[PDB]
Amino acid sequence: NMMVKFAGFLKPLKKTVLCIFLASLLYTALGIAGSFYIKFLFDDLIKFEKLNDLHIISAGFAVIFLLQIFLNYYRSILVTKLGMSIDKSIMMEYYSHVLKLPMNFFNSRKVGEIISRFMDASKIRQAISGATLTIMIDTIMAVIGGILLYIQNSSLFFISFIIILLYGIIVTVFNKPIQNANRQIMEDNAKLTSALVESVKGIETIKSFGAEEQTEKSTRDKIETVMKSSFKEGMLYINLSSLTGIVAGLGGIVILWAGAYNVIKGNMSGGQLLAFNALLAYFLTPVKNLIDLQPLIQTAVVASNRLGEILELATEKELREDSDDFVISLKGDIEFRNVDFRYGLRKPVLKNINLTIPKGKTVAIVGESGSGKTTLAKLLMNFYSPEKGDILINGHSIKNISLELIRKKIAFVSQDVFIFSGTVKENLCLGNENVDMDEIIKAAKMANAHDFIEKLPLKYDTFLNESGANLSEGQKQRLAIARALLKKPDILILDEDDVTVIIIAHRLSTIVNCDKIYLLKDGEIVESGSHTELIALKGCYFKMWKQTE
Amino acid sequence: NMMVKFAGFLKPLKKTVLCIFLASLLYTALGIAGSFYIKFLFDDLIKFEKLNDLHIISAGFAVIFLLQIFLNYYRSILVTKLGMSIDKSIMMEYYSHVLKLPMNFFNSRKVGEIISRFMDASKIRQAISGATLTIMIDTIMAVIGGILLYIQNSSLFFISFIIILLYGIIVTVFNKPIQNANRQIMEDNAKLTSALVESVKGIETIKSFGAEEQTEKSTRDKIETVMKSSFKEGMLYINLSSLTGIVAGLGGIVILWAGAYNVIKGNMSGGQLLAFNALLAYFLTPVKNLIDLQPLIQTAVVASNRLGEILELATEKELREDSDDFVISLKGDIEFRNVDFRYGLRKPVLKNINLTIPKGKTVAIVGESGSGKTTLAKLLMNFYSPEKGDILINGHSIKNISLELIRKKIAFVSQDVFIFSGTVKENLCLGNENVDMDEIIKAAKMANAHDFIEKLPLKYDTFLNESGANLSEGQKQRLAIARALLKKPDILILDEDDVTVIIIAHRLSTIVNCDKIYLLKDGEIVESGSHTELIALKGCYFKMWKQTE
């Protein structure tokens, strides 16, 4: 159904299509008129030795030809502009849809696969270029040439019709294997691209462990698979080309043979036969040219099908349920209620977890590694939806709150810090642009990131390489903290007056002054309270404290 | 030079090329023979009304054409195999070289740019194809057709020679513009791919800060540049194609005009002129097809130059000298002697470093963040070359030690952990795949990663998603510790049995039991010794201790 999207893209650009078709009509008419040059040369001028009329008629036919070139130039310009606009629209639609897909899509798929699927739009651009769509128009317009051929002679027209039927049979036979081979080679290319991206990202680890040769062998195996698919598709293309060449050449020879037979029988003159053979270039040649580009069209079709495969998935907002006047503030009691969650379909991470967080207080969540604390933090951020249960903020279900407010009023500071390629201010102004250079300074000073930025060659304007390679891991975390502080959130979640602070702590010694501490065990909260209370009743918190110390 | 590389690649294949050229010679002989059919049709059969010699001649020439198409099929298969081999060799060489470059290359470039340069080899593959490479063969073998055309008629041959000169003049002037347009479009595509990869990697941060629209605009501003470059190259191609079409059509019309004049004057006959026009397909059509293939050849040339730009950079082992023996034990006193270092051209990170680490001792390096601790660790791992300095391990220089030994006997555990897409066992076996399961289990037990691995659905075989998204971050750190422990190194470096353990710590509360503590201030060690000694000296370490606990 991607062709429906393309047609919708052609809905505003309509006068360009009409001009293209008028130019095609004029071009085809002039070519058909100029095909009679050999007939007028042999029947009238060579036979009668009319030298002067030869000169004038040849000059006139040379003049006629240039108009075809000018019209082809104009049509090619228009088609190139149309194709460029269509390709830009397709790429924007795909990218803008991908940027809002749920986190399951990004956790399941690989970066290289998505990047390759985006870059596959080059095939669509090639198929909608200025040299592949004019051939389609010529194939459509060959009806006029066929009508004129039928008027000129019925027998040779029927022979050309047999050639056309052979072309159609060949295309129908070969259409499916070609697209299957193209799909296979593009899947192999996607796998190779994923391996390439993964290898380049972790080059430091590969160098540290001396795994260059093993990585080379793995990439060599993937390249071998790619070349096997490439060879299969090349053999298919070679078979198609050989069959079409056989049909074209034998049809040309048979047409010349039957024309000679007709000329001997007196049903046609030699000039008429030559004119028919010339007009064949405006009847059969466009069709064969189209058949030549069948692999390219099929490749573009498969690429468009994959793009549509990504484009069918529902976005984050599509899976939402409602919104209302709850969008004022998230200040209140965060209350997980009978929350159950599982990642994909593995063992559940949280099993009937209930906890209430008082408003404006600094609470902390503890447990063993992998217990499901960052899972709670991501659930509070609506990155994943609980399997069953509710998460109430200020007495309102979090599903009824607009996702924009949830993402703007809750700040999550995880240890997977990401720094985008850009200036320090650009990194700190992510999603919160057009902020004056005073809030940024206040947040940087709060996050203790002011000093190292001021020590940089350009204060708050130093360009940062990809993934923050220009900074140490310590300063990168402070930049992340400052960026999250600029949000001015109602709920702040951190790893290691009226704003609620939730601390996901791994070391139990850091938090002894928290207002309330929650212990998570076996996917549920088993112990809660202050540090003194938790160490008093001699529970699992007491065991954890004694084991560590 | 990449042509030298192509010649070296083609040197082992001296049997395919000879067969290709012999098949090409036979193909051209049969194609030249067909023009004589087109001659005979209008001189002896039609004129004298021979209705049986016509059938015999037509059948014979159909047989000739069938042999010609079979030979073309065989040659195309051989050419396709040759091109596939060449492309595989090129890509494997490029990837093998890229995996060996120093860390400056990877810290200066971007993940998108390198992979874009890799995927730009598809254009070279398109250039060396089964339908493109035969066209150069036909062009170079058009010498036979030109000789026969000259033998047939001198004046029409001179007209065809003028046509070829016009083709050459046309293709000469568009060379640099087409090359520049292709280079610009490829650079813009590389930038777009870098932006795509960066956006996909950090999708979670974009979602958290609500920067979908900002990223959409940022990528739109790059898609627009790519489209502008594409439109410029499309207009250049349209101009070149229009000029080539003008030359071809006007040359054909002038050939027909001069042939008709010659026939009128009695210098030829109608059949001879038709034969000349037919044989022009083996002197002018190959040249015109080669001219029409210029965008592919130029694009492939630009891609090859882009690959060779990377291929010229020196690897790690090419910047080193000597691989002296007598060094198999990196268990001496690690010594930093007057070590100075700076990243790129910024301010120096280490200035006159002087420290010695006793062998088989657990030492700690501390200081504020950004002081140059991970820099020291990377210098020990020999990721970077210390300018104006010397690092000594036992009594030798780290420069005069095998890089494989250096990166096999020294293990570095950093704050960033990379988990490749694969099973847990395949991740613990990176670089060193030939180990028993007992050693892997022992290493996992020492790193405390055995329990959560056993709790996994398939133990040490569970597939881990890209970047270890299937596990917790706390579970990934223990996995990397086990991976580093499997090396059985002589030096172990940790970012918080005579093995030397170096602990890079940010908190002084966790290293008070270490043998010696190194404090790094202003790029040099100012305080060294034990914790008690450092407290007694009442130095900078004492101030840091008083500030926190």
Ligand SMILES: Nc1ncnc2c1ncn2[C@@H]1O[C@H](COP(=O)(O)OP(=O)(O)O)[C@@H](O)[C@H]1O
């Ligand atoms: N992206 C993911 N996909 C599938 N499973 C996951 C993912 N992230 C975490 N898990 C699983 O959920 C559990 C909870 O881990 P997590 O909450 O990250 O631990 P912690 O709270 O200690 O950081 C882990 O055992 C892990 O196996």
Ligand SMILES: Nc1ncnc2c1ncn2[C@@H]1O[C@H](COP(=O)(O)OP(=O)(O)O)[C@@H](O)[C@H]1O
């Ligand atoms: N890959 C790099 N490229 C350029 N500069 C860097 C790079 N890594 C670190 N630096 C700079 O060198 C200094 C030393 O940082 P680093 O040694 O990583 O800190 P730490 O010792 O706390 O780990 C930092 O201020 C940082 O700006």
